[PDB]
Amino acid sequence: TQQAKDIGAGPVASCFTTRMSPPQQICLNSVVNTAL
Amino acid sequence: NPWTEYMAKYDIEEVHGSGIRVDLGEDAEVAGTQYRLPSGKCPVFGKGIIIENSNTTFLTPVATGNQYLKDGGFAFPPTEPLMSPMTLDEMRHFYKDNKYVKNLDELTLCSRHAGNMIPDNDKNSNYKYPAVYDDKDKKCHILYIAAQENNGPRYCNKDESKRNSMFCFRPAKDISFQNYTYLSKNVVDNWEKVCPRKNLQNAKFGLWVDGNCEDIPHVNEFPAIDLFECNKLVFELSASDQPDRYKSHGKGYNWGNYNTETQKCEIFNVKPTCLINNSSYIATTALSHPIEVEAAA
């Protein structure tokens, strides 16, 4: 996991908010594969 | 030096400021972990990612739900409302009301669109996904996976029967990637002025010394059948942030003088500061598109 971070492995995310107003919520239809 | 501003776009350390082959130039905190993020300020023309021993193209969405890992690529999975892929038109519509973004060129718009998504754990809004713009279909593809290279039995597995194991992959330029442009969150909106794009016909990169443009005094010669293959080689040897000890800050073998007659890609790793008029040469960089040439005119 240290070396994963070091190669650019990212955080898991389920939904997102937008940076640009108006703030909007956006969700993945399903969970990203566990092995990431 | 009358060359100073013309040559400003070629000072890749300054105008790009990050890895090119692998760009992981910044860190973004999310719940106390510093994730590595692409951060280069220039578009990387023609770069894509190759998944080794695989038919999976990297713009395929990441595996979600019941899919195998090795069946998905790198791109955002489907969302509601659907954020990726998004065509140029869709983006112009979606961002029509935004003063800063609405009228951006397609590449910067694609970068700002990818950088619009805050992951739900990212209380501080640090994390911005990179993107790939495909200018044939005119579609922006947000990349869920920011990683660009992973090799060695340690961290990936090439076995096509183990479909939930991590795939190996590497960045590349390839004729099939000609229409792809790889975009960090930091792509500047004036990249057209301050970043390389076109290969310079009838020109050889040089160094300005005491009133004269001198040849690059030491280069690393690779044979190459054409300009495309030279650009590919320069890309392979260019600034890389792949394992702030691991950051290149844009330092590397980023420039090439391609001699079309001897078919030599003359590759070097210091910023050039002038041009020499030589009908045998085309001046390329790892950032430049591997096809487009600017007329000697």
Author numbering:
A (entry chain B): 2023 to 2058
B (entry chain A): 108 to 350, 388 to 441
Authors' own words:
The formation of a moving junction (MJ) between the membranes of the parasite and its host cell is essential for invasion. Two important components of the MJ are Apical Membrane Antigen 1 (AMA1) on the parasite surface and the Plasmodium rhoptry neck (RON) protein complex that is translocated to the erythrocyte membrane during invasion. Here, we report the crystal structure of the complex formed between PfAMA1 and peptide segments of PfRON2, which, together with our previous structural results on the TgAMA1-TgRON2 co-structure, highlights a conserved, crucial interaction in apicomplexan host cell invasion.
PfRON2sp1 and PfRON2sp2 were co-crystallized with the first two ectoplasmic domains (DI, DII) of recombinant PfAMA1 3D7 or CAMP strains, respectively. PfRON2sp1, traced from Thr2023 to Leu2058, includes a disulfide bridge between Cys2037 and Cys2049 and makes several direct contacts with PfAMA1, resulting in a total buried surface area of 3154 Å2 (1441 Å2 for PfAMA1 and 1713 Å2 for PfRON2sp1). Intriguingly, the backbone of the N-terminal helix and additional coil of PfRON2sp1 (2024-QQAKDIGAG-2032) overlays remarkably well with a section of the apo PfAMA1 DII loop (360-YEKIKEGFK-368) (rmsd<0.4 Å), which also includes a helical region. An influential residue on PfRON2 appears to be Arg2041, a residue specific to the P. falciparum species, located at the tip of the β-hairpin with its guanidyl group fitting snugly into a preformed pocket of PfAMA1. An additional feature of the PfRON2sp cystine loop region is the presence of a cis peptide bond between Ser2043 and Pro2044; the Ser-Pro-Pro segment contributes negligible buried surface area but is important for maintaining the β-hairpin conformation for efficient complex formation. Since PfRON2sp1 is more biologically relevant than its truncated counterpart, it is used for the following analyses unless otherwise noted.
